Amino acid sequence: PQITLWQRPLVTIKIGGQLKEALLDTGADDTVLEEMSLPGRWKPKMIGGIGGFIKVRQYDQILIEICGHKAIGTVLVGPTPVNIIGRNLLTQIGCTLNF
Amino acid sequence: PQITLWQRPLVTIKIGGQLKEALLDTGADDTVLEEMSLPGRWKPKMIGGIGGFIKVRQYDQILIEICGHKAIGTVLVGPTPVNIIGRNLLTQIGCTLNF
Numbered sequence A, B: 001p002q003i004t005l006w007q008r009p010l011v012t013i014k015i016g017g018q019l020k021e022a023l024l025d026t027g028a029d030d031t032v033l034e035e036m037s038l039p040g041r042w043k044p045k046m047i048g049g050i051g052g053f054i055k056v057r058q059y060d061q062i063l064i065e066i067c068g069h070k071a072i073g074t075v076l077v078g079p080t081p082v083n084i085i086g087r088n089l090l091t092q093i094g095c096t097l098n099f
């Protein structure tokens, strides 16, 4: 699809058997999901944004279906206030910016 | 231009007579710029991101030239680590997401 930006670019995703909404975020290097129960093993990690840092659990090779497109990659889980799809997954669904 | 997301989507901007680099950020409602000398009046404001909140100064009706496209709107100034062009200005230059 083509998505204009008059509203937040929110898409339906499916990950770890659950349905969620997430923001398509070109300013996010990585994918950060709010607290949720993922199956695999994880690694502790800290990541930085506007107001400082948050600790997250890093899961690798996680499968996500973003608006009907499948992708596998790293997912970070922790106290983000918004589910964010970052560029590590946007490149897999072929996402681009156009103006 | 069409911009793929294999690297950060950085653009050159001109704002307040100064040249800066800034991120095209579909996950940002608003435009927030690192500390810089801007002329005019401003309202104190507090915005939230991944690690908490930051106080910024809010300037309205500010001219920005973004990759050669002119836009006018609200610019927030404060302790962001990267300059972010948010959706309030992205819509003005016709920017869309495509996949």
Ligand SMILES: CC(C)CN(C[C@@H](O)[C@H](Cc1cc(F)cc(F)c1)NC(=O)O[C@H]1CCO[C@H]2OCC[C@H]21)S(=O)(=O)c1ccc2nc(NC(C)C)sc2c1
Binding pocket: A023, A025, A026, A027, A028, A029, A030, A031, A032, A047, A048, A049, A050, A080, A081, A082, A084, A086, B025, B026, B027, B028, B029, B030, B031, B032, B047, B048, B049, B050, B051, B082, B084, B086
């Ligand atoms: C700041 C930017 C450079 C990175 N930010 C992505 C932005 O899109 C966030 C996304 C968001 C939306 C949201 F609604 C709430 C949030 F809390 C966060 N927007 C945002 O802060 O917007 C603020 C201000 C503009 O107005 C409003 O917009 C909505 C809220 C206000 S990040 O989330 O901090 C992030 C993500 C991934 C990531 N991966 C890493 N890798 C490491 C290894 C280096 S570092 C890193 C950091």
